[PDB]
RNA sequence: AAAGCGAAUGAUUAGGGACUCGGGGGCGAUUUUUAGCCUUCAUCCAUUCUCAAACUUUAAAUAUGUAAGAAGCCCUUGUUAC
RNA sequence: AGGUGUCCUAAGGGGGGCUCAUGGAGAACAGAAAUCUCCAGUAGAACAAAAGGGUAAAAGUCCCCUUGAUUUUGAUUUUCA
RNA sequence: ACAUACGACCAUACCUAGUGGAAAACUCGGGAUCCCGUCCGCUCUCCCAUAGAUAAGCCACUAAGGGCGGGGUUAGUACUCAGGUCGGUGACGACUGGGGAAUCCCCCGUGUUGUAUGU
């Protein structure tokens, strides 16, 4: 019996880690603005390391989150680049998955020389309906054993919906 | 590989928190300050106005604290406005403002002060507090109570302040300020005193009804199903809500019957017991364990 | 155009690279 | 060698084991009046209005009541004389004492025994008295017969 | 004081089971980027031999605070700017 | 066995949202370590400094506003006559 | 008896795994003009109580479960207060009059209750 346990897309989170401060961030931020439609966020280097050449509290990366039909269509563009094929090792034991691309214009952005070329990281998180119980402020609790997702379901769900393949 | 954190030792050293904090219903850091009474005064009680919100109801109570549990002075549920002529929109400002007014007049009649402390009798978007009234050579300070918002969030325009406003109009002296009422502009730091009055008579939902019916027809009928069924239009809400005020202030004691099955309390007790489950005795537990041993050997 | 507030805490007044000591 | 206000209070002012965090709220609902018999017991988690380590365990009489504190009278023993100290303590460190509770219980029964006995006509025998030696009685050996014992020989256990 | 470490912190002796990609030394074509056969450390799990003035879930004996009323207990009702 | 002759307009005061160190599993360059995500996580982190006590919708952490670090004299506590 | 709201003692109530839930209550749920707040109506806030479901939360039962609470055994043992022209070269020990613990190990149990409204 599965009356209402159909998976959905809570959100899609994507990030770019250039690894060095300066105007590269500002132009990289502009990329996310045109792609998503929202305004992005700046991170802060937690631990300084001379080797990589980064100091603490120095912005080095950007990311944005999307939910709803926008998330669906952005995910669809990404998978079209990846040829509707993923590796079996891209799925967590808890039910999540993600991947990455190499050059940001495998989809349509109509390259301009005044920006450059970048790469993006996609990570997509599943869930079952009814997870407010673990995020509401009053009378919080943990979802029961039976009602949590494991790795075999998500790959099963992914294969049928997109008619993909895993190696 | 990795040392197991959740070992037996971990359990033995684990300390659990209060029962109601585990369930997530009480803020003891705040409860401590609502109930303590300055020791100069010995037995003068502290009166709390508690407000809770379910999906389909609003709960309002008047409580005093005691060393073995709280004591309930007077309770006023939202769902008892059926007798007063309301059947729709049970969780609006009007619903909140009404049940707050109900409880205020309910407690005064119980304590014997209904004739005095009239209140306002005609709601207005003004910021006023209950002042003492000269009577038969005596200056009698009004009743005092304090608000307990619980775990809710106190932002500008929440319903918790609605019930609070209703009690203040009833005649209870609730100390507060007008910096959180719907219609206060932080940039100009002054009220508008007419958007407020719309919120006591329900106009903010009436505008939604007419606006939605104009633009999106299918959504309008799908949301206001029962409003249409009982043919209550947007222009009648003010008269409906104003009319409720008259009966409720006239008498706050009419009791109605609902559509749930009803019986005597003894009858229910017999009904409930049948579905109970009986624990196992030691001999049964030992016998079943004995059987399990034989079964496993038989499987081998 | 907004700055994320890191949850992680660090010693109030220290200027140290992360102490690891493991692997190379 | 130093002498501070909390010297050597490592184990006294500590909270117990598996007793940390929230203070049970029933402490704040008690009431006190002058002449009550209270006893001091400090709580480590509250740093305001706490008494010196000497009064941790003493018993005294309330003499003043204030917003969140009471004044207690206790007797200190300096060399060859006693002195009466007046300290201010927060109610989180105090507790009503059961020292006189037995006396109050006993006086009530004494009054009513005397009243009831006067109406009937028999003397009272009300004041208590220590434990007197036992009285004679008989012990039967029917269905209980004695068993003979004897010391046991020596042997090594390890 | 005693007691305890198959209980937290700290010290400390020894086998066994599980694992190889954690390190090292071999073998099967040193083939070896073969989750092969050996094994030597290292790591987890159930056990085992000893300890703590500045360690502890427990916890004495001897000493220590208060009380055992007539200035007490119960009943009714006058004063006040709290 | 150790520590003091300092430091702070916030590192004081009030209010409000959040939870830590660390481990498991994943994601282009990225690797032992940079950034993002889920789960577990009784304090094993943090609280200017020596050591001890205390703290989890906080006493930590981020955000908003302020100067109770103000005026007038008295009572009490530890060292103690 | 059961549910909700506010509580008292603060694990006999916690953590892991598996099954069932009459009535109502509770919950997930549906939408984003207005009040309000976010990178994102995720959280917070507003509105509808129609429709769908007990999948989860919640309640109950089960496990020679971990832990926890009570008791027995360890034991009149270890220890300690007072005494002797007691033993022994010493280390230390026995006796007389009294007080008297703690592990390992064994057995049982798995919340009790106040105020108000309603099933």
PDB file of N, CA, C and O (backbone and C1' of nucleotides) in Angstrom, chain E residues 35-54:
ATOM      1  P     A E  35      41.241  -6.386  -7.610  1.00  0.00           P
ATOM      2  O5'   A E  35      41.939  -6.399  -6.177  1.00  0.00           O
ATOM      3  C5'   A E  35      41.341  -5.737  -5.067  1.00  0.00           C
ATOM      4  C4'   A E  35      40.975  -6.690  -3.953  1.00  0.00           C
ATOM      5  C3'   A E  35      40.133  -7.899  -4.358  1.00  0.00           C
ATOM      6  O3'   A E  35      40.465  -9.002  -3.512  1.00  0.00           O
ATOM      7  C1'   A E  35      38.942  -6.603  -2.783  1.00  0.00           C
ATOM      8  P     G E  36      41.887  -9.742  -3.642  1.00  0.00           P
ATOM      9  O5'   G E  36      41.606 -11.209  -3.085  1.00  0.00           O
ATOM     10  C5'   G E  36      41.026 -12.211  -3.908  1.00  0.00           C
ATOM     11  C4'   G E  36      41.968 -13.371  -4.112  1.00  0.00           C
ATOM     12  C3'   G E  36      42.751 -13.823  -2.888  1.00  0.00           C
ATOM     13  O3'   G E  36      41.995 -14.667  -2.035  1.00  0.00           O
ATOM     14  C1'   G E  36      44.210 -13.639  -4.737  1.00  0.00           C
ATOM     15  P     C E  37      42.311 -14.732  -0.461  1.00  0.00           P
ATOM     16  O5'   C E  37      43.668 -15.560  -0.356  1.00  0.00           O
ATOM     17  C5'   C E  37      43.737 -16.919  -0.768  1.00  0.00           C
ATOM     18  C4'   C E  37      45.158 -17.424  -0.767  1.00  0.00           C
ATOM     19  C3'   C E  37      45.925 -17.230   0.533  1.00  0.00           C
ATOM     20  O3'   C E  37      45.631 -18.223   1.503  1.00  0.00           O
ATOM     21  C1'   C E  37      47.264 -16.525  -1.282  1.00  0.00           C
ATOM     22  P     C E  38      45.213 -17.816   3.004  1.00  0.00           P
ATOM     23  O5'   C E  38      46.600 -17.560   3.750  1.00  0.00           O
ATOM     24  C5'   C E  38      47.318 -16.355   3.541  1.00  0.00           C
ATOM     25  C4'   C E  38      48.756 -16.463   3.974  1.00  0.00           C
ATOM     26  C3'   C E  38      49.170 -15.602   5.159  1.00  0.00           C
ATOM     27  O3'   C E  38      48.818 -16.138   6.421  1.00  0.00           O
ATOM     28  C1'   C E  38      50.708 -15.287   3.414  1.00  0.00           C
ATOM     29  P     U E  39      47.837 -15.311   7.385  1.00  0.00           P
ATOM     30  O5'   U E  39      48.849 -14.388   8.198  1.00  0.00           O
ATOM     31  C5'   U E  39      50.107 -14.910   8.608  1.00  0.00           C
ATOM     32  C4'   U E  39      51.205 -13.876   8.573  1.00  0.00           C
ATOM     33  C3'   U E  39      50.897 -12.523   9.184  1.00  0.00           C
ATOM     34  O3'   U E  39      50.817 -12.514  10.610  1.00  0.00           O
ATOM     35  C1'   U E  39      51.943 -12.195   7.110  1.00  0.00           C
ATOM     36  P     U E  40      52.102 -12.489  11.580  1.00  0.00           P
ATOM     37  O5'   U E  40      52.611 -10.980  11.525  1.00  0.00           O
ATOM     38  C5'   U E  40      53.977 -10.670  11.748  1.00  0.00           C
ATOM     39  C4'   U E  40      54.243  -9.191  11.634  1.00  0.00           C
ATOM     40  C3'   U E  40      53.291  -8.277  12.378  1.00  0.00           C
ATOM     41  O3'   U E  40      53.577  -8.213  13.761  1.00  0.00           O
ATOM     42  C1'   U E  40      53.726  -7.401  10.218  1.00  0.00           C
ATOM     43  P     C E  41      52.498  -7.590  14.769  1.00  0.00           P
ATOM     44  O5'   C E  41      52.993  -6.092  14.967  1.00  0.00           O
ATOM     45  C5'   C E  41      52.064  -5.047  15.190  1.00  0.00           C
ATOM     46  C4'   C E  41      52.373  -3.840  14.343  1.00  0.00           C
ATOM     47  C3'   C E  41      51.329  -2.745  14.359  1.00  0.00           C
ATOM     48  O3'   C E  41      51.416  -1.937  15.516  1.00  0.00           O
ATOM     49  C1'   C E  41      51.994  -3.153  12.132  1.00  0.00           C
ATOM     50  P     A E  42      50.183  -1.881  16.539  1.00  0.00           P
ATOM     51  O5'   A E  42      49.190  -0.836  15.868  1.00  0.00           O
ATOM     52  C5'   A E  42      49.675   0.376  15.315  1.00  0.00           C
ATOM     53  C4'   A E  42      48.730   0.909  14.273  1.00  0.00           C
ATOM     54  C3'   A E  42      47.263   0.876  14.655  1.00  0.00           C
ATOM     55  O3'   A E  42      46.917   1.935  15.531  1.00  0.00           O
ATOM     56  C1'   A E  42      47.534   0.112  12.430  1.00  0.00           C
ATOM     57  P     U E  43      45.742   1.761  16.614  1.00  0.00           P
ATOM     58  O5'   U E  43      44.411   1.585  15.763  1.00  0.00           O
ATOM     59  C5'   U E  43      43.978   2.594  14.865  1.00  0.00           C
ATOM     60  C4'   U E  43      42.711   2.185  14.166  1.00  0.00           C
ATOM     61  C3'   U E  43      41.622   1.628  15.063  1.00  0.00           C
ATOM     62  O3'   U E  43      40.898   2.650  15.721  1.00  0.00           O
ATOM     63  C1'   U E  43      41.842   0.274  13.133  1.00  0.00           C
ATOM     64  P     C E  44      39.899   2.288  16.920  1.00  0.00           P
ATOM     65  O5'   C E  44      38.548   1.916  16.171  1.00  0.00           O
ATOM     66  C5'   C E  44      37.431   1.433  16.893  1.00  0.00           C
ATOM     67  C4'   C E  44      36.642   0.433  16.091  1.00  0.00           C
ATOM     68  C3'   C E  44      35.956  -0.646  16.904  1.00  0.00           C
ATOM     69  O3'   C E  44      34.737  -0.202  17.464  1.00  0.00           O
ATOM     70  C1'   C E  44      37.057  -1.625  15.054  1.00  0.00           C
ATOM     71  P     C E  45      34.495  -0.310  19.044  1.00  0.00           P
ATOM     72  O5'   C E  45      33.991  -1.806  19.238  1.00  0.00           O
ATOM     73  C5'   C E  45      32.858  -2.275  18.527  1.00  0.00           C
ATOM     74  C4'   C E  45      32.795  -3.779  18.512  1.00  0.00           C
ATOM     75  C3'   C E  45      32.905  -4.463  19.860  1.00  0.00           C
ATOM     76  O3'   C E  45      31.692  -4.435  20.589  1.00  0.00           O
ATOM     77  C1'   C E  45      34.271  -5.581  18.286  1.00  0.00           C
ATOM     78  P     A E  46      31.708  -4.174  22.174  1.00  0.00           P
ATOM     79  O5'   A E  46      31.952  -5.620  22.794  1.00  0.00           O
ATOM     80  C5'   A E  46      30.918  -6.591  22.787  1.00  0.00           C
ATOM     81  C4'   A E  46      31.457  -7.981  23.004  1.00  0.00           C
ATOM     82  C3'   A E  46      32.195  -8.218  24.308  1.00  0.00           C
ATOM     83  O3'   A E  46      31.326  -8.439  25.403  1.00  0.00           O
ATOM     84  C1'   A E  46      33.440  -9.130  22.527  1.00  0.00           C
ATOM     85  P     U E  47      31.860  -8.224  26.900  1.00  0.00           P
ATOM     86  O5'   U E  47      32.973  -9.352  27.069  1.00  0.00           O
ATOM     87  C5'   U E  47      34.128  -9.125  27.862  1.00  0.00           C
ATOM     88  C4'   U E  47      35.147 -10.222  27.689  1.00  0.00           C
ATOM     89  C3'   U E  47      36.289 -10.225  28.686  1.00  0.00           C
ATOM     90  O3'   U E  47      35.929 -10.786  29.933  1.00  0.00           O
ATOM     91  C1'   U E  47      37.159 -10.507  26.518  1.00  0.00           C
ATOM     92  P     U E  48      36.485 -10.132  31.288  1.00  0.00           P
ATOM     93  O5'   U E  48      38.052 -10.382  31.199  1.00  0.00           O
ATOM     94  C5'   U E  48      38.578 -11.692  31.312  1.00  0.00           C
ATOM     95  C4'   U E  48      40.068 -11.704  31.102  1.00  0.00           C
ATOM     96  C3'   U E  48      40.883 -10.906  32.098  1.00  0.00           C
ATOM     97  O3'   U E  48      41.062 -11.581  33.328  1.00  0.00           O
ATOM     98  C1'   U E  48      41.637 -10.436  29.916  1.00  0.00           C
ATOM     99  P     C E  49      41.214 -10.746  34.690  1.00  0.00           P
ATOM    100  O5'   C E  49      42.748 -10.339  34.712  1.00  0.00           O
ATOM    101  C5'   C E  49      43.752 -11.335  34.776  1.00  0.00           C
ATOM    102  C4'   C E  49      45.110 -10.729  35.000  1.00  0.00           C
ATOM    103  C3'   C E  49      45.168  -9.615  36.023  1.00  0.00           C
ATOM    104  O3'   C E  49      45.192 -10.099  37.352  1.00  0.00           O
ATOM    105  C1'   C E  49      46.385  -8.990  34.099  1.00  0.00           C
ATOM    106  P     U E  50      44.807  -9.126  38.566  1.00  0.00           P
ATOM    107  O5'   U E  50      46.033  -8.122  38.635  1.00  0.00           O
ATOM    108  C5'   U E  50      45.894  -6.861  39.256  1.00  0.00           C
ATOM    109  C4'   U E  50      47.036  -5.949  38.907  1.00  0.00           C
ATOM    110  C3'   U E  50      46.952  -4.564  39.510  1.00  0.00           C
ATOM    111  O3'   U E  50      47.386  -4.529  40.856  1.00  0.00           O
ATOM    112  C1'   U E  50      47.474  -4.384  37.219  1.00  0.00           C
ATOM    113  P     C E  51      46.679  -3.536  41.896  1.00  0.00           P
ATOM    114  O5'   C E  51      47.140  -2.101  41.394  1.00  0.00           O
ATOM    115  C5'   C E  51      46.500  -0.924  41.851  1.00  0.00           C
ATOM    116  C4'   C E  51      47.127   0.295  41.231  1.00  0.00           C
ATOM    117  C3'   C E  51      46.460   1.619  41.544  1.00  0.00           C
ATOM    118  O3'   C E  51      46.843   2.129  42.805  1.00  0.00           O
ATOM    119  C1'   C E  51      46.938   1.488  39.229  1.00  0.00           C
ATOM    120  P     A E  52      45.798   2.959  43.688  1.00  0.00           P
ATOM    121  O5'   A E  52      45.804   4.406  43.026  1.00  0.00           O
ATOM    122  C5'   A E  52      46.974   5.204  43.043  1.00  0.00           C
ATOM    123  C4'   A E  52      46.723   6.560  42.437  1.00  0.00           C
ATOM    124  C3'   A E  52      45.541   7.329  42.996  1.00  0.00           C
ATOM    125  O3'   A E  52      45.856   7.997  44.202  1.00  0.00           O
ATOM    126  C1'   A E  52      45.540   7.451  40.626  1.00  0.00           C
ATOM    127  P     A E  53      44.884   7.899  45.474  1.00  0.00           P
ATOM    128  O5'   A E  53      45.036   9.328  46.152  1.00  0.00           O
ATOM    129  C5'   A E  53      46.292   9.984  46.155  1.00  0.00           C
ATOM    130  C4'   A E  53      46.143  11.466  46.372  1.00  0.00           C
ATOM    131  C3'   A E  53      46.036  12.310  45.115  1.00  0.00           C
ATOM    132  O3'   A E  53      44.703  12.352  44.642  1.00  0.00           O
ATOM    133  C1'   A E  53      47.520  13.318  46.691  1.00  0.00           C
ATOM    134  P     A E  54      44.387  12.416  43.074  1.00  0.00           P
ATOM    135  O5'   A E  54      44.634  13.943  42.714  1.00  0.00           O
ATOM    136  C5'   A E  54      43.721  14.941  43.139  1.00  0.00           C
ATOM    137  C4'   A E  54      44.153  16.300  42.663  1.00  0.00           C
ATOM    138  C3'   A E  54      44.425  16.411  41.172  1.00  0.00           C
ATOM    139  O3'   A E  54      43.241  16.659  40.433  1.00  0.00           O
ATOM    140  C1'   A E  54      46.229  17.349  42.388  1.00  0.00           C
TER     141        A E  54
END
